[PDB]
């Protein structure tokens, strides 16, 4: 009985049926919800909405009320408790490279975001909750525990605003807030087009019919293009540093200047759809710039799809990863491809595999320069690094030989992330992302740890010791219980986090279920997945299982030196090759010979 439903943020829905390309909405994907897995839409729920008052007040929000009759603990407390630690030695991946922990960010932006509620154009709503720490409407301030470190030098709190819902923006009343997903849910590189008309357009470089991205006209890689800049100010990128004054960049997705490496990512997305561009039109000299455009994407998109499933999801889900992707079968109407909103708390698991350093490495895979090592938290909206000290080269050879953190039960996060995020808006690299995860939980009104074991089919632990045997962990399971009085109360991103991580993968059974039924749903439920049938051609489709990740970097960088899998752990220069080794994405059977 849950109604026709509401829908009034997003406008109207008019679809061309035989196009051959994706919207860039999303719409039009499934024929019979034209919406479905369409951005700016609600997030999908898989189970019920839990708030404090059924509806939209977050757990925690009032002092009095308890959750199943205990009160959730601080989210600045949980994290300085549980998710913090000291010591970086001993923390790293032996068997992935810098370059996994990326590309997880990266079909992250791909497929979600909730931003905050916009309530602050000319008011001082957000400088207030900055200013005074006080709760109210959509600030819902992170507070410090008395032994902070952070009340000393910092003030009472974290500023904290709630996500956007769907409908209205001012307070509704019948039925559970539901935060809105703003890209498509589709692996579909919306990342580097956009997922709204608007910025899709201007991203292009309409200048030329040549099918082209627009790239920077200010700055160049040793002759390879950048992104353009955005020039909206105030730019957080030039923030951290007003002397070299350096914008942040303009992309598919507006967190693409969050940390360098992101951004590096995001340059080598944008060559790759230029350069297959220009491959494109040698081969056809006919078609427009449209056409050129289109296609680019379409392989583009092909090409993140095929990385993601076949050499990611395999090292992040491993033994799990059979039993919730088997072998692909078809596209199936009735698959809803929406991404969950518990699954955008569910691949956080992310924050844990960022490692607190970031290096530039030569043509030799050795140090570039006297601060070739820098700390993470120097990185984050830095896009000088880029343009005015070596561009992006260096940092992908970083990407390549360095390591990712291994997510550990005594070394959760890294205090770059914990204690040193910068946010835009605000002045200081002094925010902690763990505790924003876990205020974000409860914002969003996620059920508890069990509800989601239950969900997936797992035991549900309702004391210590059987808590100390689902983590295999005495102490953790000690201090989660401390904190939250039962495994009921525990907030999914940090229960999901402690389990420890199935054979063959990076990530615990409750996770890998979650990441595991998404990314089928993601996959059966897309009418455009390059290897549904009538899609590309089966001659293209044989050329598009050549693609890697080496190849795009050979591709569209000077880096003459690569690993044949790059995401585990690679030593130069023993597991490096030269880029001729390497096979290549041939590009003959888009030949169009229409005569
Ligand atoms: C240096 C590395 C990274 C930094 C500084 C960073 C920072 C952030 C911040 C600030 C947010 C928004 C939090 C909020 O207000 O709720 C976020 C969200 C998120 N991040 Fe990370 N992140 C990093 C890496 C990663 C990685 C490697 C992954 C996954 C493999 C990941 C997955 C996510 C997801 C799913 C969200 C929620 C996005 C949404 O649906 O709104 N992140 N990140
Ligand atoms: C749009 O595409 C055109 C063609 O690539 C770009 O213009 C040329 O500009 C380059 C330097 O960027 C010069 O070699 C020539 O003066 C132009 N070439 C031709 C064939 O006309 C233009 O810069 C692009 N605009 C953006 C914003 O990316
Ligand atoms: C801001 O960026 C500037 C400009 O890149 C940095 O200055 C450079 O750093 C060293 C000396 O400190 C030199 O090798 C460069 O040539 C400098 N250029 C100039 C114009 O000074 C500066 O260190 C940055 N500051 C911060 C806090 O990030
Ligand atoms: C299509 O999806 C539905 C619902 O997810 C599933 O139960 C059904 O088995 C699928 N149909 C086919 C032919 O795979
Ligand atoms: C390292 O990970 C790869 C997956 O990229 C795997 O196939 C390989 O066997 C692993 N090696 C070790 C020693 O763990
Ligand atoms: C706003 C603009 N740019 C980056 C922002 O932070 C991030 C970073 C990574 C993921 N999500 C949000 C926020
Ligand atoms: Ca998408």
Redesign the pocket.
């Known amino acids: 009985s849950w109604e026709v439903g509401c829908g009034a943020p997003v406008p109207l829905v008019k679809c061309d049926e035989n196009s051959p390309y994706r919207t860039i909405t999303g719409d039009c994907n499934n024929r019979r919800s034209p919406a479905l897995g369409a951005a700016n839409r609600a997030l999908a729920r898989w189970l019920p909405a839990e708030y404090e008052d059924g509806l939209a007040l977050p757990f925690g929000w009032t002092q009095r009320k308890t959750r199943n009759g205990f009160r959730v603990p601080l989210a600045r407390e949980v994290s300085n408790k549980i998710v913090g630690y000291l010591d970086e030695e001993g923390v790293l991946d032996?068997?992935?490279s810098l370059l996994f922990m990326q590309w997880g960010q990266i079909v992250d932006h791909d497929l979600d975001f909730a931003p905050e509620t916009e309530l602050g154009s000319n008011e001082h709503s957000k400088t207030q909750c900055e200013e005074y720490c006080i709760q109210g409407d959509n600030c819902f301030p992170i507070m410090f525990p008395k032994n902070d470190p952070k009340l000393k030098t910092q003030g009472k709190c974290m500023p904290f605003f709630r996500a956007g819902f769907v409908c209205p923006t001012p307070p509704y009343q019948s039925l559970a807030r539901e935060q809105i997903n703003a890209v498509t849910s589709f692996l579909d590189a919306s990342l580097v087009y956009g997922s709204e008309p608007s910025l899709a357009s201007r991203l292009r470089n309409l200048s030329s019919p040549l099918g082209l991205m627009a790239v920077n006209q200010e700055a160049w890689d040793h002759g390879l293009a950048y992104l353009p800049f955005n020039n909206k100010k105030p730019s957080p990128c030039e923030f951290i540093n007003t002397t070299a004054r350096v914008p942040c960049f303009l992309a598919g997705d507006f967190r693409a200047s969050e940390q360098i490496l992101l951004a590096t990512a995001h340059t080598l997305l944008l060559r790759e759809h230029n350069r297959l561009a220009r491959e494109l039109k040698k081969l056809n000299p006919h078609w427009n710039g449209e056409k050129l455009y289109q296609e680019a994407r379409k392989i583009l998109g092909a090409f993140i799809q095929i990385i993601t499933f076949r050499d990611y999801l395999?090292?992040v889900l491993g033994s799990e990863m059979q039993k919730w992707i088997p072998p692909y079968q078809g596209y199936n109407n009735s698959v809803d491809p929406r991404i969950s909103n518990v699954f955008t708390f569910a691949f956080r698991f992310g924050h844990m595999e960022v490692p607190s350093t970031v290096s530039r490495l030569d043509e030799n895979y050795q140090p570039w320069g006297p601060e070739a090592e820098l700390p993470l938290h120097t990185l984050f909206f830095n896009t000088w690094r880029i343009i005015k000290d070596g561009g992006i080269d260096p940092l992908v050879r970083g990407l390549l030989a360095k390591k990712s953190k291994l997510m550990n039960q005594d070394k959760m996060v890294t205090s770059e992330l914990r204690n040193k995020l910068f946010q835009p808006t605000h002045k200081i690299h002094g925010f902690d992302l763990a505790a924003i995860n876990l205020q974000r939980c409860r914002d969003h009104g996620m059920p508890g740890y069990n509800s989601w074991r239950g969900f997936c089919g797992l035991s549900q632990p309702k004391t210590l010791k059987g808590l100390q045997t689902v983590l295999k962990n005495k102490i953790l399971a000690k201090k989660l219980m401390d904190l939250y009085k039962t495994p009921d109360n525990i907030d999914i991103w940090i229960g999901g986090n402690a389990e420890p991580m199935v054979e063959?993968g990076r990530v615990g059974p409750l996770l890998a279920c979650l990441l595991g039924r998404q990314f089928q749903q993601i996959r059966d439920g897309d009418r455009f997945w390059w290897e549904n049938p009538g899609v590309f051609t089966e001659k293209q489709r044989d050329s598009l299982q050549k693609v890697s990740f080496s190849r795009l970097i050979c591709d569209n960088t000077h880096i003459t030196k690569v690993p044949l899998?790059a995401?585990?752990?690679n030593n130069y220069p023993h597991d490096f090759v030269d880029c001729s080794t390497v096979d290549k994405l041939d590009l003959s059977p888009w030949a169009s010979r229409e005569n």
């Open positions: 032996q068997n992935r395999p090292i063959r899998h995401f585990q752990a």
